[PDB]
Swiss-Prot record, chain B:
Covered range of the whole protein: 530 to 777 of 777
Protein name: Glucocorticoid receptor
Gene name in the database record: NR3C1
Effect of residue 185 to Q: In GCCR; uncertain significance; reduces transactivation; reduces affinity for ligand; exerts a dominant negative effect; does not impair DNA binding
Region of interest called Interaction with CRY1, as start-end residue ranges on this chain: 3-168
Effect of residue 61 to A: Reduces activation mediated by ligand binding domain
Other information: Can up- or down-modulate aggregation and nuclear localization of expanded polyglutamine polypeptides derived from AR and HD through specific regulation of gene expression. Aggregation and nuclear localization of expanded polyglutamine proteins are regulated cellular processes that can be modulated by this receptor, a well-characterized transcriptional regulator.
Length: 247, 248
């Protein structure tokens, strides 16, 4: 079987919010439900990441580092895709029973962040992104940030990253053809992945409740998910090589 | 020692939010902090209620019922007092490091509820409520709702309620004097306690995530705080005698 179809099978079922819409709107209840959903999304993200080809073959300290940097990248990109595939970048589709209109979030500080999240769906809409392109792109967001000093299994990471870069290229070829059109498209899609660093920096700034200097050296996925969930870690930019396709 | 000074000693130390105000405002972070604070306030409310004279002498099924009805009454009244004593009913003073301005909560659904909470502080400000009056009044809010069929230790409850009514009367006398002025004041303070039923009905409607018909008969009473916190229970009005000093 193809590497895209392996990424397609491991992609989880959509989570439902468990939210009553027939009752009158309570912003307290929405935010409570979002927090419960976000915790469940981190369980699903870690489970997904461990099923990615190549990821298991890395060192466990490398595996737990990548997920610590990349959890918000994955959730916010997937949010972009769902919002794109449902409403066409008008509504924030957190779950099928928890769709938030932008005009509902009237507060400037909340509105500002909804724009950052809607930017991802807008660009997915603008570039008319394929489901196979999304799958490769999402895998590259797991592999988008590295420690400054470096990983333990650094040479294997590079080879894992470059094969998923090639797999994005393969997903571009299936659209139509022409070397000019493909190169330009590969530019556009990598420019979006680059811009996710600036998107996530805002979203993390908004919600983080613990600042750490370096990554925590965790071994086990049951521990990891609880560490991310309870304290919502922001790791300092000085010790992260944020990988970019373009300067 | 006097019954007011017993209520004064058992009154807990003010909880701090653990919130950084020097950073720019995130409404996500405020609401996260409020949820953590609200859980801690329920631990304190149950601990307080068990230390009230008379309350321990009731049946455990009566004790667990009163706290199930009255938890939001206690927290929202205390919120009113802190907001009164700190900002003079302009700001919602959830904790000393988590003071929320009404103009900050621009959303209509959030604004509407902030007005309900600010009403309590406004009335405490208007009536110039003493700290001893607040303490008796807050004790009566624990004893403000009863099941329709009734409590097990119902005659003892009535005597516990009526002594705390008399203790409010004693706290009124310490202000100045005159039988006319006291009676009128006792009217005004009981009218506030009556209006807390309508306040709490709104606040519960806004935040409840489990609707139950009757009160839960809990088996390990220490579990109560966790039951209130995790599910945020609203109990149906049909099976509650909401006690009022004056009917409507
Ligand atoms: C337990 N943890 C750790 C957690 C808690 C909650 C979440 C939210 C709320 C976040 C953090 C938001 C980013 C800024 C935020 O604070 C917000 C918000 C508004 C809407 C403006 C209220 C984020 C976007 C990605 C996402 C996708 C989704 O499918 C559902 C959740 C989700 C969120 C994420 C993680
Ligand atoms: C899970 N638990 C056990 C819990 C969680 C959180 C709380 C809040 C938030 C509530 C429910 C609010 C009433 C409507 C609400 O949802 C709100 C709100 C706005 C500000 C509009 C965002 C309530 C008022 C009393 C109170 C006093 C206080 O010292 C601190 C908290 C507090 C609250 C109460 C209980």
């Amino acid at each position: 079987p193809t590497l895209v179809s392996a990424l397609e099978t491991i992609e989880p079922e959509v989570l439902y919010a468990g939210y009553d819409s027939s009752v009158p709107d309570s912003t307290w209840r929405i935010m409570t439900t979002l927090n419960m959903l976000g915790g469940r999304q981190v369980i699903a993200a870690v489970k997904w990441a461990k099923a990615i080809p190549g990821f298991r073959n890395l060192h466990l300290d490398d595996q737990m580092t990548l997920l610590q940097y990349s959890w918000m990248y994955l959730m916010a990109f997937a949010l972009g895709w769902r919002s794109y595939r449902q409403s066409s970048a008008n509504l924030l589709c957190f779950a099928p029973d928890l769709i938030i209109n932008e005009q509902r979030m009237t507060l400037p500080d909340m509105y500002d962040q909804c724009k950052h999240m809607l930017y991802v769906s807008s660009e997915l809409h603008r570039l008319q992104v394929s489901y196979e392109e999304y799958l490769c792109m999402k895998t590259l967001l797991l592999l988008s940030s590295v420690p400054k000093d470096g990983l333990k299994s650094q040479a294997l990471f590079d080879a894992i990253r470059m094969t998923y870069i090639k797999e994005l290229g393969k997903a571009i070829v299936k659209r139509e053809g022409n070397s000019s059109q493909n190169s330009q498209r590969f530019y556009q899609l990598t420019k979006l992945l680059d811009s996710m660093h600036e998107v996530v920096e805002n979203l993390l700034n908004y919600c983080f409740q613990t600042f750490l200097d370096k990554t925590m050296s965790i071994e086990f996925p049951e521990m990891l998910a609880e560490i991310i969930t309870n304290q919502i870690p922001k790791y300092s930019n000085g010790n992260i090589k944020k990988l970019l396709f373009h300067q």
